[PDB]
Structures are given as structure tokens and as C-alpha cells.
Amino acid sequence: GAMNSSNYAELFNNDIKLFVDDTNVYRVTVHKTFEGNVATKAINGCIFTLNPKTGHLFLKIIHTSVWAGQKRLSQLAKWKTAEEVSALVRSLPKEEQPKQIIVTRKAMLDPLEVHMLDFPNIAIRPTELRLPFSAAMSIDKLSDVVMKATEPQMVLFNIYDDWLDRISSYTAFSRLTLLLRALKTNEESAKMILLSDPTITIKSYHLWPSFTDEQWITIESQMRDLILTEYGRKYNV
Amino acid sequence: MNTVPFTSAPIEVTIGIDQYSFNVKENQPFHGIKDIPIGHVHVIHFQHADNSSMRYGYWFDCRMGNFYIQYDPKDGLYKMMEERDGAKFENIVHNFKERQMMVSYPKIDEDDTWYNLTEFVQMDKIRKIVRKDENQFSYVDSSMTTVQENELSDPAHSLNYTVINFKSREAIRPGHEMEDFLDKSYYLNTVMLQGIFKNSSNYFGELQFAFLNAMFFGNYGSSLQWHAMIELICSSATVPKHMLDKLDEILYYQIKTLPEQYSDILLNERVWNICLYSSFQKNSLHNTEKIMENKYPELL
Ligand SMILES: CCOC(=O)N1CCC[C@H](C(=O)NOC)C1
């Protein structure tokens, strides 16, 4: 059934699973027309498909051409997401295919279920967790590859960089979700924290800076403070 | 006009004949039902006074044989049987009639209700849904499960309705996933109408039979089937005009006949609200929407 706080350690067991987040598939800017009406302009989007155990991220870039001449784009986007995830699964060797796919938004359940009818043994699950994967486009290298794409494209990343050499998956996911929650609550402050110290760099083959274990503890503390800071600014506390 | 004689009535029971119901007391001179209209299927059904558990009954067509009812004290129910000796049967019936120990089928001449509920129902199709080929009549009760219910357990006692499942490979063409899920016309017109039922008459017959089993026996899987067959039509953007008009008439008479006090259990809020107010056919069921709004406005 649904994934929640109670069954959270299941994310890090040895059954292959993927989270699918569709928030950033259909992205628009709303603007005024010459006549004073409102219109939208689509920009490139992405499906965020993540193995929480290994950090492997399958970033399917959604180019604005896929929406040309289509109607009801917010509904289409869910089915296009499901089409692309099903295509990804079919492209993987059998022993790499997931046993479960967890969708971060319940509106993806029926589209994914229908696209996966050929895979009756792959469980499609919702989650009660409020995960911050919408903030993936706040990671500069992911935003850059999405915006620069001129055609549909799949790009593969490890969203944990090399962290699993030193920490467990559970801890790596906790770090990722804290980073993304912070970037979602106050992007400017979060990026300031991550780069305030010019001596710490991001390796060419990495997404995040090369913090030592001790520096990650400081960074993680600064991110929590930020989240609590924003929480007080928001609610006046 | 045909007759279903009863050998006797040893236990107190409410007897149904089509949409009529009446009580019989423990051991009264009740010997059966006469003046049954020829040309329709019929259902004779039972609810014991001492144990309302298990409504049960028999679908039959008097054109196919001479049928009677006889209580079986071992199995504890009123059983339908066929009498193969015609002269024996005519003599039994004529004697019970002469002694006026039969209730007369209460049909009002103006009243087309039963025709309207059974327009497309045919004994031969009932006997394929209810499999017991040694008898010309078909037993149904409150507890019998459907083939689909069993998939999700005795197959000889199942209701073999046509399986409808909107999230199935039968319903969804590879490559038309969104199209076929949001507009079920392919599944209705090619898979079900052309493929399985052959024509809309057979589809409506199964729909009507499913409703009647839901209503007369409280058969839950029958209610599921009735609603699935409605939903498949309403969720199709392309339906022949003659089917939509007939569907409106069918549902109108089903809603009209439904006991007001059973609406809570026999009517699925989601399906009806979807069909009348959100679906492709939200404007194609004028009579049904009007009677639903005036009779069950709570549900909506
Ligand atoms: C449908 C009409 O029958 C009834 O309403 N009944 C209840 C009262 C007694 C009647 C009866 O058994 N009469 O003939 C033997 C049956």
C-alpha cells in the first residue's frame, strides 16, 4: 500500500525500487498578451526518477516540442510521465527492473498503472511522505541540462555523488531530502550556505560540493536552522 | 397464460413473482401462481420467514416446459422442478384452479413494468450466465459470487457475467493507453459489442439481468456488474444513438422500480454522479437524470 513514516526503512532494502516525481514535467511561465489576456509559455521540464538505495537518477528531459498542438497539458503530462517511466523499465535488463515504483503524487497512480499493465508484478504505490523532489531544478547542473536541451534526452546522474563510500543509503537519503527541503523553502539562502566557502568546490563529475564529514555536519545544521528560520518567518513564531 | 403449481407450502415464506411479493403462512392452501404472462422470462423467489438469510429463486420461461415448486425438507428450500408428463401437469393445474388455491399474477393492464425491465433478457442467455444444463430454469441466490469476484470460490455455483475491468489489457490497446482509459469507446464498441456480445441487445440483456439479481436477491456481485456495464457506456465518447436512447429507458424503469428504502445499498454514488454529471453521456440520459433527481436527490 502507501509508503509512509512507519515503513520508511523499506526504501533501503535490497528490492529495487524507484521514486517517480512528475512535478517538473510540465512547466510554464504565465504572461499577458498584447490584447491584455493571459497566456502560458512552456519551458523544458523533466521527470525525476530516483533509486533511493543507490542514488541513481534517471532524468528524462521533457522538451517543449512534446506539448505542441496538444490540449489539456496538465493531464497529458501525467500520461507522458507514465509512458516514459514504462519505456525506461522496458529498456532495463530484467534483473535491473524495479519491483516497486513509488509515485510522489497520487494523480500518477492510474496513468502509471495503465502503462505498466505488461508488468503485473511491479507494484505501483503512493506515499504519504511530502518529499521535496520538486526542488531538483534548484540543483544547478540539473537545471542547466534541462534548459539547454533541444530535443528529448535521458541523462543519468548519481544524486548522492560519492557519499555512499562513507555513509549508508538511509543517511544519504536523509541528507538529500534535507538539502532539497532547504532549497525549496529558501533557495537563495540554501545556495548561499552551500557555496559561502570558495575553498570547497563541486567536482566536475558531482552535483554537490566536496564537503568533509565534519563540514557536512555543519552544513546539515545550517540547513535545519534555515528551514526553522523560514518556518518562523512564515508563521510568525 | 401459464401456471406454476406448488405441491405445498410447509414453511412460512414470502414468495416473489417478478416485481410482486406476498406472504404465505406455515401450511395454508397455497398451491401456486396462475395467469403468468407468456412471452417474458419470469423469476419466482423466496425469503423464509424464520431465516431471511438467503433470498433465492428461479428464472424460467413457461414456453420451455411445465415447471412446479416443491419444498424439500432435507435441503430446506422450495425447489423448482420440471414435470415431463403433460397430462399429469394439466390435470394438477386444472384441479388447483377449480379449487381456487392459486394466486393470480396481479398484472395491471396498463402496466408495462415487467416488459420494460426484461426487454432484452432471454432464457438462453441466463442459462449461460447461470450454468446448470440439466435444468431449463436457473437458480440464483443472495450469496452466489461472480467469476470476477472469484478471481480477486466454487465455480459450478458462480454467476458467469462478462468480465469488465477498466485497467486490463483487454480494455487498453498498447500505445493508446491515455486515449483508451479516458474514452472507453474502443472497449465498448470493438471489444465488448462487436467482439463478445455481438450486439447491443445481448449487452442490455446482461445489464438488465444483473440489475434484477441485485434487486431481488441483494446479490452484491450482480450490483457490481450492473454498475460496470452502465459506466462503460457512459465513459465512452462514441456510442450509437439508439443505444443511448434505449439505455435511458432501461435505467429509468430500473430506478423507478427500485424500493426507495434499498437505494442506500443498491446504488453506487460514484458511478451515478460520474455518469449523470461528469461523463461523456452526462446529457444523454434525460429521463434517468430526472427520476434520479426527484427520487434520490440525497445520493447526488
Ligand atoms: C399477490 C396477491 O397475494 C397476496 O397478497 N397474498 C397474501 C394474502 C393471501 C393470498 C393467498 O394466498 N390467496 O390464495 C390462496 C396471497
Contact A111 B177 (CB under 8 A): yes
Resolution value in angstroms: 1.6
Q: Is B235 in the A-facing interface, judged by CB distances under 8 Å?
A: no
Q: What is the best residue among B20, B22, B24, B30 to mutate for testing ligand 1's pocket, by most ligand atoms within 8 Å of CB? A: B22
Q: Are B139 and B157 in contact (CB under 8 A)?
A: no
| Residue identifier of the C-alpha nearest atom 11 of ligand 1 | B103
| Residue identifier of the C-alpha nearest atom 5 of ligand 1 | B22
Task: Give the fold, CATH level 3, of A164-237.
Answer: Acyl-CoA Binding Protein (1.20.80)
Question: How far lies A97's CA from each of A68, A87, B142, in Å?
Answer: 32, 11, 45
Does domain A9-163 correspond to CATH entry 3.30.70.360? Answer: no
Does domain B116-299 correspond to CATH entry 1.25.40.550? Answer: yes
For the record, the C-alpha cell of A38 comes out as 493571459
